[PDB]
């Protein structure tokens, strides 16, 4: 019909998940103008006319869309591999966020993933108390921007470094991680990178999973086919570490192995497979059968040792293989202060004491500025470097 078509079209223009909604269409034009405004291409008639035809229109567009100078930087609080994360306040709304930056030139310069899509999709739609929420995402010719909620409590690395964690606490944080990963699994994802660095606490002291740069979608059988290893040297599982072209076909059990490494560190004080070098940890992990030993100290309860061992073993025997419910039924979690279905409603072991909306005490000092980072080379001919990052924007068509 003539109306059914006009309707179907209006869906693809509004739906927050359309490949061509207002966010994607306003980006596509913004990408073209950016990737044409070079004197070596201005010699072409069509390009020179097009840029002069849209010059006044495109400068009005960029002044109205969300841009970097809309935010007031307060302090740098994190360093990612591709860009820093800074505590900012929106100049107009006065609201405080944690803004993440991603250098476009850097990611294009050999980072075989285009990973930002998976993290943008989860943090924006997950709608879970265990997942850090993405509020806005925008871009320009240099960086990608991810405006997320600020976690004032800090990461679990900072907590472990300033405390000797007792079992009561370890039980709480391990249980909150288990529910956090089960929520990510329900979305159809294997995390592949579970570690304290990616765990942050809110203003109440409860745990959330920040960063999802290594998340991948499971198939119908619930497995993942990968030819290259992914993760962190200490927390990586035996099957993900030996990932090769011969197969490389693992399930979600690898995530629970990392939770066992996480529990071991909170009690013992060190990683279960520490070494003098980095490549030593590798041999120690592949030989987990004989290398996994607890130090001579009576303070690790029988149950704690049992769970850590139930996680740190071969995939086929490893606990958590028959669903997440057999992990929750474990005796280590058997306590008398909370229940699973009401855990994030109970009072946290360490409640943070904050002075203001911008209290950054739980975050160690960084440097700021660094000068100016070099970006893409000025094109001689049409390169089209913004085409990969088209439609990353999350502003005009957000889900409410």
- List the binding residues: 77-85, 100
Count of residues that bind ligand H52 according to CB under 6 A: 18
Residue 276 in contact with its own copies, rule: CB under 8 A: no
Write the binding mask 95 to 114 for ligand H52: x where contact by CB under 6 A, - elsewhere. ---x-x--------------
Of the ranges 193-201, 306-314, 326-334, 372-380, which one interacts with ligand H52 (CB under 6 A)?
Answer: 193-201
Q: Which two tokens stand for residue 113?
A: 């993933």
Nearest-angstrom CA–CA distance, 5 and 268: 64
Token code pair at residue 79? 């360093």
Query: Rounded to whole angstroms, how far apart are CA atoms 75 and 36?
Result: 35
- To the nearest whole angstrom, how small is the minimum distance from the Cβ of residue 234 to ligand H52? 15
Report the alpha-carbon distance of residue 86 to residue 98 in Å, rounded.
6
Annotated binding site for ATP: 77-85, 100
**Minimum distance from CB of 194 to ligand H52 (Å)?**
12
Using DSSP, state whether 240 is helix, strand or coil: helix
The H or E element that residue 177 is part of is: helix 167-186
Q: What distance in Å separates the CA atoms of residue 248 and residue 240, rounded to the nearest whole number? A: 7
194 interacts with ligand H52 by CB under 6 A: no
From the list 30, 193, 202, 234, the catalytic residue is 193
Please give the C-alpha separations between residue 48 and each of 26, 35, 38, 44, 58, in angstroms, as whole numbers. Answer: 20, 12, 9, 6, 14
Query: Out of ligand H52, its own copies, none, which partner does residue 22 contact, by CB within 5 to 8 A per kind?
Result: its own copies
Least distance to ligand H52, CB of residue 264, Å: 21
Phi, psi of 148 (to 5 degrees): -120, 175
- Segment 30 to 49, residues that bind its own copies, using CB under 8 A: 32, 36, 41, 44-47, 49
Whether residue 191 contacts residue 215, with contact meaning beta carbons closer than 8 Å, is answered with yes
Length of the chain: 400
193 a catalytic residue? yes
Q: Is residue 176 a contact point for ligand H52 (CB under 6 A)?
A: no
Cβ 12 to its own copies, closest distance in Å? 7
Q: Which does 54 bind (CB under 5 to 8 A by kind): ligand H52, its own copies, none?
A: its own copies
Instruction: Say if CB 10 and CB 18 are below 8 A apart.
Output: no
Query: Is 68 among the residues that bind its own copies (CB under 8 A)?
Result: no
Contact residues toward ligand H52 (CB under 6 A) are 77-80, 85, 98, 100, 132, 148, 150-151, 155, 197-198, 200, 210-211, 363
Positions marked active-site: 193
């Amino acid at each position: 019909s003539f109306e059914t078509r006009f309707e179907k079209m209006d869906n693809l223009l509004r739906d927050p998940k359309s490949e061509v909604n207002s966010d994607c269409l306003l980006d596509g034009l913004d990408a073209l103008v950016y990737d044409l405004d070079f004197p070596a291409l201005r010699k072409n008639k069509n390009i020179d006319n097009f840029l002069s035809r849209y010059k006044d229109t495109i400068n009005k567009i960029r002044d109205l869309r969300m841009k970097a100078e809309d935010y007031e930087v307060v302090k740098v609080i994190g360093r990612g591999a591709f860009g820093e994360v800074q505590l900012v306040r929106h100049k107009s709304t006065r609201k405080v966020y944690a803004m993440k930056l991603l250098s476009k030139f850097e990611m294009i310069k050999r980072s075989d993933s285009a990973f930002f899509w998976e993290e943008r999709d989860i943090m924006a739609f997950a709608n879970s108390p265990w997942v850090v929420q993405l509020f806005y995402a925008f871009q320009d010719d240099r960086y990608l921007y991810m405006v997320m909620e600020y976690m004032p409590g800090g990461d679990l690395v900072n907590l472990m470094s300033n405390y000797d964690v007792p079992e009561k606490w370890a039980r709480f944080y391990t249980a909150e991680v288990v529910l956090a990963l089960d929520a990510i699994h329900s979305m159809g994802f294997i995390h592949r990178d579970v570690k304290p660095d990616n765990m942050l606490l809110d203003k109440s002291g409860h745990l959330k999973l920040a960063d999802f740069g290594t998340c991948m979608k499971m198939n119908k059988e619930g497995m993942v086919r990968c030819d290259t290893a992914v993760g962190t040297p200490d927390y990586i599982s035996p099957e993900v570490l030996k990932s090769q072209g011969g197969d490389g076909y693992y399930g979600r059990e690898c995530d629970w192995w990392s939770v066992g490494v996480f529990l071991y560190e909170m009690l013992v004080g060190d990683t279960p497979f520490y070494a003098d070098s980095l490549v030593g940890t590798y041999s120690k992990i592949m030989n987990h059968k004989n290398s996994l030993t607890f130090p001579d100290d009576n303070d690790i309860s029988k149950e704690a040792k049992n769970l850590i061992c139930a996680f740190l073993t071969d995939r086929e025997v490893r606990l958590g293989r028959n669903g997440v419910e057999e992990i929750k039924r474990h005796l280590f979690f058997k306590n008398d202060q909370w229940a699973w279905e009401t855990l994030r409603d109970t009072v946290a072991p360490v409640v943070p004491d904050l002075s203001s909306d911008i209290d950054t005490s739980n975050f160690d000092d960084l440097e700021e500025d660094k000068g100016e980072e070099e970006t893409f080379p000025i094109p001689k001919a049409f390169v089209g470097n913004q085409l990969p990052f088209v439609g990353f924007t999350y502003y005009s068509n957000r889900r409410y």
